[PDB]
């Protein structure tokens, strides 16, 4: 998160650390949508171009976390992935269209002051919410600057940008499964997600039932916090169908 703020305790309960066992390092962000299912970015798991191909073994899941580095002794719970599911038409070769994956924990996670899941959106949530200007919130343990590292989980509220802007900001081919976020330079307000932010969620709180929903999944972008540049997020709503498909197929 670039030009963000430290999380508050219990502020983001769904947040997950994608943790690589060996070496021992965070690989990404992610989210608990249930006590047995975690939602990340397909690229946190597979990326041929970069010789990335995490198998369930290579991974552990850390929930309850606030502090990046330390083992959060009686606060966090560490899970083992049971199964991994990559979006069948995830496009690593091009624009990371359908950047979405699911990980089903080897055993049920227990809810708490620090561990509790986010809602996934309905068609009408998304409608009223994902409108340019509307603010959402990103979290991570990722880079604090394009080119430090946080001690504590980081937060940043960013305005959803009108599609056209997204498009005229890049050379990459944006899809309907994508939305971009940030301030315009006019706007003189800063904040980006950054490296190691992938997989985290873009959540907004519904003002109707004042529930927290994951609108997005931190995907890609160019640099971190670069003027006339935006962060791109997978469109959860857009993939929700893919989502009940696997959960009601082999799920919790």
């Amino acid at each position: 998160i670039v030009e963000g703020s430290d999380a508050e305790i219990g502020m983001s309960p769904w947040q997950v650390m994608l943790f690589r066992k060996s070496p021992q390092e965070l690989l990404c962000g992610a989210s608990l949508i249930s006590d047995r299912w975690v939602l990340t970015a397909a690229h946190c798991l597979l990326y041929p171009p970069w010789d990335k191909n995490f198998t369930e073994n290579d991974l552990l899941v850390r929930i309850g976390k606030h502090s990046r580095t330390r083992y959060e002794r009686n606060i966090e719970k560490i899970s083992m992935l049971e199964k991994i599911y990559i979006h069948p038409r995830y496009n690593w070769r091009e624009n990371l269209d359908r950047d979405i994956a699911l990980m089903k924990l080897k055993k049920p996670v227990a809810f708490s002051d620090y561990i509790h899941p986010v809602c996934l959106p309905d068609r009408e949530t998304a409608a009223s919410l994902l409108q340019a200007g509307y603010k959402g919130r990103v979290t991570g343990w990722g880079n604090l600057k394009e080119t430090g590292q946080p001690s504590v989980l980081q937060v940043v509220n960013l305005p959803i940008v009108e599609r056209p802007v997204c498009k005229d900001s890049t050379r990459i081919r944006i899809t309907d499964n994508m939305f971009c976020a940030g301030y315009k330079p006019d706007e003189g307000k800063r904040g980006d997600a950054c490296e190691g932010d992938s997989g985290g969620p873009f959540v907004m709180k519904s003002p109707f039932n004042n529930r927290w929903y994951q609108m997005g999944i931190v995907s890609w972008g160019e640099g971190c916090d670069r003027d006339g540049k935006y962060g791109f997020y997978t469109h959860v709503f857009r993939l929700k169908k893919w989502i009940q498909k696997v959960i009601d197929q082999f799920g919790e």
Binding site: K21, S22, Q24, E25, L26, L60, T69, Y71, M80
Partner: peptide
Amino acid sequence: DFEEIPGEYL
């Protein structure tokens, strides 16, 4: 840079 985790996890 990461502090050590309970081996029960590995």
